[PDB]
């Protein structure tokens, strides 16, 4: 999983921000969202989302679909650590199981069901 956000912001600063934002908003989780490599989907200008821990993956799909103006017939897949997360999972559960060492959760989105194809 390569994220441009991690190229743009050194780890030491990401970790400091993640620690502070979890203390400030403990009922939310910090999520970095980016297009998967070679996905044919519109860009997402906003990459930083503070998501209620109880929000479902399905609710988050609905939000991102709207933000990138998908047509009804367009597909959308999420990837976390190279795997599609269950639609019924909460974002807090995904965070607990997959956050990186900077305390952020990284989600890639794509029109393909295989990451980076």
């Amino acid at each position: 999983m390569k994220f441009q956000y991690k190229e743009d912001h050194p780890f030491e600063y990401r970790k400091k921000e993640g620690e502070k934002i979890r203390k400030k908003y403990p009922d939310r989780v910090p999520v970095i969202v980016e297009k998967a490599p070679k996905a044919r989907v519109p860009d997402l200008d906003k990459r930083k989302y503070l998501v209620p821990s109880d929000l479902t993956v399905g609710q988050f799909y609905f939000l991102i679909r709207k933000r990138i103006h998908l047509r009804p017939e367009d597909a959308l897949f999420f990837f976390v650590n190279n795997t599609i997360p269950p639609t019924s999972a909460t974002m807090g559960q995904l965070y607990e199981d997959n956050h990186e060492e900077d305390y952020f959760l990284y989600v890639a989105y794509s029109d393909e069901s295989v990451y980076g194809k």
């Binding site: 906003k46 930083k48 399905g58 609710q59 988050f60």
Partner: peptide
């Protein structure tokens, strides 16, 4: 940049 504050209990279809 700033965090987007996502609202609770939104739609899903």
């Amino acid at each position: 940049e700033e965090w987007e504050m996502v609202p609770r209990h939104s739609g899903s279809g």
